[PDB]
Symmetry: C3
């Protein structure tokens, strides 16, 4: 009756194999795998609240935690290389990983706090890109940064709602 149980394991396995395969590839391609990963992790959380499966939550929490650091590494290197566009994309996947991590926390304060620092770090990083973008005079890039700035803020209010 549980055909999705095979499909659930099949999906993460294909993503994890791709993630290791794409690790050496272009950062933009790496961000694409992380985008699908955090999109996948949300449904593994959605299919563990329906289940009594607490073990599946630990799996999704580890993958969301690992996806968070991967987005952070690409964000640090991209900003160092001068690419604010690819960098700003990385914080987007970073906060998205933090958002699902906060959802994973509900039904462990340490996971909620861990997701909080992930969101807090993202807000700190985008602030540097936003303030820098205003200095460079690129109003178009400030929109993307301000668009992101709202998204971390929108996520950050949810942690308060989670208490």
């Amino acid at each position: 009756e549980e055909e999705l149980k095979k499909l659930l394991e099949e999906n993460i396995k294909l993503i994890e194999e791709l993630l290791e395969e794409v690790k050496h590839n272009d950062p933009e391609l790496l961000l694409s795998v992380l985008e699908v990963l955090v999109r996948s992790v949300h449904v593994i959380a959605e299919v563990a609240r329906e289940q009594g499966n607490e073990e599946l939550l630990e799996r999704a929490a580890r993958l969301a935690e690992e996806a968070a650091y991967q987005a952070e590494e690409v964000a640090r290197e991209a900003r160092k290389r001068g690419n604010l566009e690819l960098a700003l994309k990385a914080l987007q996947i970073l906060v998205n990983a933090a958002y699902v991590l906060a959802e994973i926390a509900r039904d462990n304060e340490e996971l909620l706090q861990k997701a909080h620092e992930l969101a807090r770090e993202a807000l700190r990083q985008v602030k540097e890109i936003l303030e820098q973008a205003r200095k460079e005079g690129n109003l178009e890039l400030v929109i993307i940064a301000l668009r992101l700035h709202t998204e971390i803020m929108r996520v950050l209010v949810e942690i308060w709602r989670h208490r």
Copy 2:
């Protein structure tokens, strides 16, 4: 019989007339209108469950079913013509049409509709699986991303079917 009821009928008339017009034109435009069809059906299902218009459930479910089969034919032809992107794009509207069909099935209690949506997901899973091995063979890592993105979305449909 409110004022929104007129807007619902007005929307389906414009969608149905366009769908027949673009069938002979290009699949990409046909996919765009088909995408709105499942988007429109989702909002019409939410107001027929709220207004208790059980007749509208059959109408909205039929349109999602028709959008599913229309998405499937263009998905089948696209893979035959070698356009895996348009095929993978078409499968997205298919699973979304299957998703709303599964959601209507669980609410209305139509066990036949739940399996029909289930087979739609099974068909979509077969195509992406075939596309995935093909995309991996040609070395197009970009296409496996779209396929894995689609593959993940199929799981969301299977989660809802089990919830019934």
Copy 3:
């Protein structure tokens, strides 16, 4: 435990300062920030207040700017920016209706309804025009918009 209040004020302050500066710049750029502006007002859902009235006012001002760009776009003959501008109008109407139900402002609910009702009127005109002009691609964009006003208008009915 009100650490977000600084970030909340920082978001509205950064958006409002940018919104006033870019208004005279490019219409496409003005529409994009208005999308972020209407996205920013959504954070007002957290009702702790005095800041709620400020953010609700900002949504009112963002609504008219999208309509003004929509009017000029149709006047300039570019239906594309109009449908894009009309799109941001409907989200502004959507967020305005949600804020109305929080404080129970029945006048705001009818006001937000009229923006969507008018937005459906313009998009209906563009749709018949786009089909008449033969730009089948624009009819999809117009029909794409048409669904969203219906989704917002259906939600407004769910309130009353």
